[PDB]
């Protein structure tokens, strides 16, 4: 910031192979990585989950790789996502949700495992339960119609060498189309 600018820490749309994000507990209905398309019609890695019929009360977790924070005291996280209208999903029931919750946890090295940091608030720091202003609709026989949602969250103040972001779903039906972490330098 001898020249002032925003500096990227992570941009999923630039991943050319697979993201390798870690999921838990890896049961039926788990988060799945899928190839999607961005605004330039280029292939990008995305994550989807839609466990609304079988077990809408089962939590499904998704964790990023470890992100070294460099000088950053606050980091911004821009999330772009589709959220299905519960009423469009056949045999979704009363338990279906139209939100997901975003957490982070700071660590001094990339020490996470399949089971740790423990998959729960504390250690994870709850940032926001994110609502969707735009619901995607699908009517029998027809193409889905909808808009993409965007939410930017501010994380910090940060003090350890790096951090993980984690997403908790429980009975929602959504596609995480992109994550971009950046800070002001």
């Amino acid at each position: 910031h001898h020249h002032h600018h925003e500096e990227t820490l992570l941009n999923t749309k630039l991943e050319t192979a697979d993201l390798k994000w870690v999921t838990f507990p890896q049961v039926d209905g788990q988060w799945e990585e899928l190839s999607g398309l961005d605004e330039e019609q280029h292939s990008v890695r995305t994550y989807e989950v839609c466990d609304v019929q079988r077990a809408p009360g089962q939590a499904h977790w998704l964790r990023t790789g470890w992100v070294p924070r460099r000088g950053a005291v606050h980091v911004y996280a821009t999330l772009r996502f589709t959220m299905l209208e519960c009423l469009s999903l056949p045999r979704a029931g009363r338990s279906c949700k139209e939100t997901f919750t975003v957490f982070y946890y700071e660590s001094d090295a990339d020490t996470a495992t399949a089971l740790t940091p423990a998959w729960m608030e504390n250690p994870y720091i709850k940032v926001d339960t994110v609502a969707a202003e735009h619901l995607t609709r699908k009517r029998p026989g027809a193409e889905a119609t909808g808009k993409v949602n965007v939410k930017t969250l501010r994380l910090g103040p940060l003090s350890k060498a790096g951090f993980y972001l984690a997403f908790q779903d429980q009975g929602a039906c959504m596609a995480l189309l992109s994550l971009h972490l950046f800070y002001k330098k």
Binding site: L34, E48, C50, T82, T136, A144, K147, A175
Partner: peptide, 14 residues
């Protein structure tokens, strides 16, 4: 406007 995959858990809802 890409919203979700033809091959994922969302598509499987129908």
């Amino acid at each position: 406007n890409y919203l979700f995959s033809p091959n994922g858990p969302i598509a499987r809802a129908w």
